[PDB]
């Protein structure tokens, strides 16, 4: 393939400018340190901008709430050949990593929380800018491979993502994955559709969530910023935190907020779609809660790996 | 005893005034409808006002964020002789209950989510106003029972609550409960301490979380406000949603935000306390995240039941 | 008993908000680090708010000068089973301690200066909130110990302290302690009186005063904030700095600024009081200079130790 493993770092921060300033200054440094490991294959950092309302099921929400929200959630995707690589980068580069993610403590409201995911399905294209399409069309014809010419999925904040949260009834996992996967395939008929993938949580990176034992806890709260908590003081292993009921993420990319709204809305507006999707809805404990997120900074080459 | 069962309804809403207006108008109606069932024994509704920062682990947060937050979370405690009573009140009084909780859809950002809890430990006194203490002191002396004279835990928004979230490593449950319980006992030496209880999640009320199957989902999103989703379209039973890893709530009441800050802070500042509590910290997957919440509207008589 | 040993950290800082912000962020961290030692038994941090004027002996001063002062003095009390424990906590946890107290260099005008004291007399009760008194009255009657029911000394900034400085003529030490001790006993007849204690300086913690030899001095002034001066470069031992003439602190707690003003003023207004106190006044080289200070953050359990 290969389908890499995905770690998603989640945090809530003050939606003021000091926050975006720090992002601008250390976001880069952290991603550079994460690239010190050969298992690292790329990333996709998102900033949550809104919530899909579903009519008025969520009246206080809108797809773009950036102008009215007091906090902002980030969702940072790091891709790995093997999820154990992730844990090991965290351990190897702890003094940089930690002193770095602390500088933004003054802005933290919740987090960090870094669950680990495995990919059940993935239909994600290589990101191209509108300037590349002539040569992409020219290369594929040159090798007689027109079917390999994809939609133009623009990188660096020029497309939106629907990030849907689902918790499944135990024993219902197969019906759910099957119905969702087929929904994501039918989504290819929708205009503005840039790809999607089903994600399944297989554990939580305790060290990435700043979750240590009694000792680490204390160095965490007592830290001046220039000393790290003992990284070996993480009391559990990623898999020990695999949750039951099972938890999924239906990640779907769209051209714009309307393509997203009416494309997804398809499982609600098209009888054909709506009947396949109702099966997924019969297996749910929680969901679907859909966050609208923006792929701001990324290393689009993780996709080069996904498609080898 | 009896230790009742506790259901905690959680929702995030726009922190504007239209929201508090609706609260003022339907909160009453909902609680009245919940009292149509004999299993109902009282309630405790909280509004989240802040977050315990732990120094600057959570720099963007403070114990009182009511002036700067764009959303507000409520935590409504309903008490039951038996948790099955709760599910049955929801079912019996669905047309009122549902049409009622919808009127506040226009203000919803997330929720409702109503997990069910069982009490592992409970040291909660009967709420008294400063005007009652003369007679409470007089009655107990009259029966030669001075030890039964409690601290004055004022009702209706005149005390704060620390609402701590903990997720425990599987197999570590006994060490955690034991260390926490003994911490809550040592907390009686702290000034301003009004009581506490350890809560353990045993499932989720799907009907209280507006979690139906394909069919209900659709009536939920298509509702004009005057029609309910089929309540029998809830696809799972509360216990099927018992989570692993195990999830707890260390609910601790204090006289004020400082008594809370330095009382709890005791597991950090007092060597005696700090060593007992470190054991709880060794069993954690998540936590402790502490929300400061305000017991605004309540039916203090649920406590009369807890202490029989 | 036991009468613990007391170390009092003194510093002058800019009375602007950046200062109180840092207090809010690192004060907690420092006290947490100080609790890593079993000799630590609690603390009492004060912020100076004013000066007792004595009529118009000090005309430019008032009991509350917080609105007009450009600097602010803090007086942080840490309690120890044995004063050597204090020196050893400083040494053991130097990298945290130091990098922590530096972050507030940008706000320092003078200090740190941490003299060590021994208690000659102590009449300090356990701090209770107005919510605890019903149960305190109920427990003591339950054991037939009404004399053990104390005044309500509220914690966390809800009472004032008179911090009086006295330097005694050598050879006059006994007359002074005897007259002062009896004054503090007569003070129990004054309304609003919450306790007191006579303090005697027995040395200075050079490491707590950032007082090193040539070498440390240099690392102190050259520090980027992420490196500590050699802690073994402290050239003297606490006792070598015991001062002659002898220096005392008459620490007296009151309900409010008026109870303090007229309670103390008693050694001036009541003939009975005034004649006992005149003897203390005959042994003085310096004093009495009385600072009004506010017990803002504390670990009231140090008092649990004092009264065992
Ligand atoms: Fe990570
Ligand atoms: Fe309910
Ligand atoms: Fe010190």
């Amino acid at each position: 393939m290969p389908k890499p493993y995905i770690a998603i770092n989640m945090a809530d921060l003050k939606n003021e400018p000091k926050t975006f300033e720090m992002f601008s200054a250390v976001g880069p440094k952290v991603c550079m340190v994460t690239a010190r490991h050969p298992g690292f294959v790329g990333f996709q950092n998102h900033v949550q901008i809104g919530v899909l309302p579903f009519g008025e099921r969520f009246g206080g929400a809108k797809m773009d709430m950036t102008k009215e929200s007091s906090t902002v959630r980030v969702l940072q995707y790091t891709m790995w050949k093997d999820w154990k690589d992730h844990e090991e980068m965290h351990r190897q580069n702890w003094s940089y990593l930690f002193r770095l993610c602390y500088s933004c403590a003054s802005q933290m409201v919740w987090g960090p929380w870094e669950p680990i995911y495995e990919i059940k399905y993935a239909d994600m294209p290589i990101n191209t800018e509108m300037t590349d399409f002539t040569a992409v069309v020219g290369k594929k014809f040159a090798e007689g491979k027109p079917l390999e010419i994809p939609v133009i999925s623009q990188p660096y904040g020029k497309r939106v993502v629907a990030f849907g949260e689902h918790t499944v009834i135990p024993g219902k996992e197969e019906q759910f994955e099957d119905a969702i996967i087929k929904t994501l395939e039918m989504f290819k008929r929708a205009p503005g559709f840039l790809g999607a993938m089903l994600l399944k949580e297989i554990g939580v990176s305790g060290i990435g969530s700043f979750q240590f034992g009694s000792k680490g806890f204390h160095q965490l709260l007592e830290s001046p910023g220039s000393l790290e908590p003992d990284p070996n003081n993480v009391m559990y292993q990623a898999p020990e935190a695999k949750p039951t009921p099972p938890q999924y993420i239906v990640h779907v990319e769209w051209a714009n907020l309307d393509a997203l709204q009416f494309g997804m809305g398809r499982v609600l507006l098209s009888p054909e779609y709506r009947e396949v999707h109702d099966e997924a809805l019969d297996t749910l404990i929680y969901g679907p809660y859909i966050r609208i997120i923006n792929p701001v900074m990324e290393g689009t080459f993780w996709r080069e790996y996904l498609n080898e």
Side-chain angles (χ1 to χ4, degrees), chain A:
Chain A
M1 267 145 5
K3 287 181 176 51
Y5 275 100
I6 300 185
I8 302 176
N9 194 282
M10 302 159 173
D12 283 329
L13 301 100
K14 288 188 75 194
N15 178 24
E16 61 196 29
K18 192 175 169 193
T19 277
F20 288 93
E21 268 159 38
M22 71 126 334
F23 286 165
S24 279
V26 23
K29 302 172 126 135
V30 178
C31 289
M32 295 197 270
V33 177
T34 307
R36 307 214 285 218
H37 197 275
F40 180 75
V41 292
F43 68 106
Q44 199 164 299
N45 288 2
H46 313 79
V47 144
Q48 191 187 338
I49 59 171
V51 184
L52 190 62
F54 293 107
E56 62 175 309
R57 164 77 177 78
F58 296 109
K62 22 199 221 149
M63 295 196 277
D64 189 352
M65 289 152 80
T66 45
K67 248 110 57 129
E68 43 173 70
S69 194
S70 62
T71 82
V72 80
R73 186 171 285 201
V74 299
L75 300 109
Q76 350 227 253
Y77 289 38
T78 34
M79 289 54 189
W80 310 88
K81 283 180 162 142
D82 169 42
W83 64 264
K84 277 185 169 271
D85 288 326
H86 172 255
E87 302 292 88
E88 187 190 354
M89 178 284 311
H90 268 281
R91 300 205 149 82
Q92 267 151 42
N93 308 276
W94 192 227
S95 39
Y96 274 85
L97 264 199
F98 174 81
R99 312 191 177 188
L100 279 181
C101 295
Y102 209 65
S103 44
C104 31
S106 74
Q107 312 294 126
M108 297 260 351
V109 178
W110 177 89
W113 190 243
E114 199 177 346
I116 313 275
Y117 300 78
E118 87 192 320
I119 310 170
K120 287 304 185 178
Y121 170 85
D123 178 39
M124 306 287 270
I126 47 161
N127 298 298
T128 57
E129 289 274 39
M130 296 286 312
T131 60
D132 308 322
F133 89 75
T134 38
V136 164
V137 152
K139 195 187 74 147
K140 293 274 154 182
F141 264 84
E143 40 213 35
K145 288 157 186 173
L147 262 19
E148 289 173 39
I149 295 183
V151 297
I152 306 163
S153 171
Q154 289 152 99
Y156 318 132
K158 302 193 278 301
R159 61 177 199 302
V160 274
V161 174
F163 176 96
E165 308 183 349
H166 302 75
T167 300
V168 187
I169 297 165
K172 280 305 148 180
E173 303 106 323
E174 277 242 335
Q175 184 178 331
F176 170 65
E177 311 188 346
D178 262 66
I180 263 340
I181 290 181
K182 183 193 189 172
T183 292
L184 302 182
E185 308 193 285
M186 290 168 74
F187 273 164
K188 321 238 274 278
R189 283 187 279 154
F193 176 71
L194 305 173
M197 71 189 170
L198 179 59
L199 255 34
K200 211 234 179 145
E201 197 186 328
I202 63 181
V204 175
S205 163
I207 186 182
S209 319
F210 288 1
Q211 284 289 173
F212 304 100
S214 84
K215 170 186 171 189
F217 178 67
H218 288 296
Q219 303 163 306
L220 210 217
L221 306 201
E222 294 155 21
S223 184
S226 36
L227 305 154
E228 325 80 49
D230 169 17
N232 300 295
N233 190 219
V234 178
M235 308 302 276
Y236 60 95
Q237 295 166 64
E240 301 183 57
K242 184 172 168 146
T244 285
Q247 271 165 203
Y248 296 88
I249 290 178
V250 195
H251 173 110
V252 196
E253 322 212 311
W254 301 90
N256 51 67
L257 290 178
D258 272 355
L260 186 164
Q261 192 183 7
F262 300 117
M264 307 275 276
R266 232 139 141 132
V267 300
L268 297 184
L269 308 171
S270 175
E272 157 148 281
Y273 280 76
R274 174 159 177 171
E275 170 203 306
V276 180
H277 187 260
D278 287 347
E279 300 182 51
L281 293 170
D282 282 1
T283 75
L284 296 188
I285 283 211
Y286 172 68
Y289 194 65
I290 303 190
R291 306 181 176 242
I292 313 306
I293 64 175
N294 191 335
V296 175
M297 348 155 23
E298 26 174 18
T300 80
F301 47 88
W302 73 272
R303 279 163 193 252
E304 271 158 54
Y305 179 81
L306 175 72
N307 293 307
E308 294 181 352

